[PDB]
Design a protein around this ligand. Structure first.
Ligand SMILES: [Zn+2]
Length: 258
């Protein structure tokens, strides 16, 4: 039936409804740090989030999204391997039922507790809908989360989860600053890939940050209390909403650092 992360509707079943699941540039992938090619041509990333305007937080049945006003160049990403300006539209996380799993991408086979994705679309295309149809339509910034000390900037998000426990629930979520989720360093790996949830379109330039951010176990615990189900239905906890690593195939991962 509808895609999900369960035994009968999980990742291994997706290809039946979305054949692209078996495509040539699918994500996520395992980052082999020894075979990644350091590229001197890669410029530094430019993250301009000081004018960012968040509007709402929503439980979509497979995770939660924090949405932003993308009607103007308020929160943009440029530089790095990107040509042009990319507007922030929303961010979401992927996590596990246990601290030893949860991330989509892995580094030398290592899995992190969760992975944050900041989705941006190329302004040359006019709207998100047109952008996903292009090979250079999206730019997604991936950040790993490890369990350790608490991330002060994540608490606002953690506190509002009670309000959107079930599928379809949404809440006002204004004045949230995404800068508080960024690691100290901006060194990264980059490769051409896809969305990790259906429709799985191959329109993404992935920018995966080397440095993980730390969050407390109490913080990730609250993520695990969300529900996949709608109100009044049998409770199914939202855990392990991650897709496993796909074949790299004809692709080379480049590093911005040595
Ligand atoms: Zn994602």
């Amino acid at each position: 039936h509808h895609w999900g992360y369960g035994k009968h509707n999980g990742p291994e079943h997706w290809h039946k409804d979305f054949p692209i699941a078996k495509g040539e540039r699918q994500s996520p992938v395992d980052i082999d740090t020894h075979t990644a090619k350091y590229d001197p041509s890669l410029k530094p990333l430019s993250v301009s989030y000081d004018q960012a305007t968040s509007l709402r937080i929503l439980n979509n049945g497979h995770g939660f999204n924090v949405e932003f006003d993308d009607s103007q160049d308020k929160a943009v990403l440029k530089g790095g391997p990107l040509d042009g300006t990319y507007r922030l539209i929303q961010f979401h996380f992927h996590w596990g039922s246990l601290d030893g799993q949860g991330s989509e991408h892995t580094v030398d086979k290592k899995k992190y507790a969760a992975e944050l994705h900041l989705v941006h679309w190329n302004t040359k295309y006019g709207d998100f809908g047109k952008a996903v149809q292009q090979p250079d339509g999206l730019a997604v910034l991936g950040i790993f989360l490890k369990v350790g000390s608490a991330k002060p900037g994540l608490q606002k998000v953690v506190d509002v989860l009670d309000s959107i426990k079930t599928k379809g629930k949404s809440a006002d979520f204004t004045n949230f600053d995404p800068r508080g989720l960024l690691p100290e360093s901006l060194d990264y790996w980059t490769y051409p890939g896809s969305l990790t949830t259906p429709p799985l379109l191959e329109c993404v330039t992935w920018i995966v940050l080397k440095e993980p951010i730390s969050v407390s176990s109490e913080q990730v615990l609250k993520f695990r209390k969300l529900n996949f189900n709608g109100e009044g239905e049998p409770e199914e906890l939202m855990v392990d909403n991650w897709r496993p690593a796909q074949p790299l195939k004809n692709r080379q991962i480049k590093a911005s650092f040595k």
